[PDB]
Amino acid sequence: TNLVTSSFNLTKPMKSFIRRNGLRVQESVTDETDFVILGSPPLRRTHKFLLATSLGIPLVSSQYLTDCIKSGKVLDFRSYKYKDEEAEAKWGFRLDDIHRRTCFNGKRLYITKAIRDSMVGDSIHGLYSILETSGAEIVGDIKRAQEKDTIILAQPDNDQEGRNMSATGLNVYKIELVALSILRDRIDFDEFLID
């Protein structure tokens, strides 16, 4: 059984239990991941969380591992499904909606230069990773993006490519489209339209 941790630091005893009970920690979420252990609420909307959600992988409370240790056995992770009603109301989604997302399957997306430059580090890496794992293709250049079959993600202000596309008649959208769409398994385009 394969697991990933997000916003949670594993202790040495936890790693010992894992080593001995035929569990394995992974560096990244993949289609072979069985569940993701999340740090205590409030839920943090990390790359790993969004990948797990996109791929239909259950989210599990950290308490699971401690309780496993206390019982000596691998408990059922299902007793420990992650719960956070506040996040559910805040972002408008269900944690019990555990299934592979299809909303980005076959979609073409373009992320403006402003976004690519202005998210140095993990943020944009998680963006590209989530999109391609979710079945989307990133178009090769802004010219190809200037088509109605492409979702253009831009910054609402201070985005020259964004404004230039708007001035063609093309709609451009805020980056949040990606995360919330994954959470909802639906793209609510109007919510994220920049104008």
């Binding site: 997000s6 990390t46 790359h47 969004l50 998680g126 995360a179």
Partner: peptide, 6 residues
């Protein structure tokens, strides 16, 4: 360093 949120 902390896992970034999107």
């Amino acid at each position: 360093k902390p896992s970034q949120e999107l």
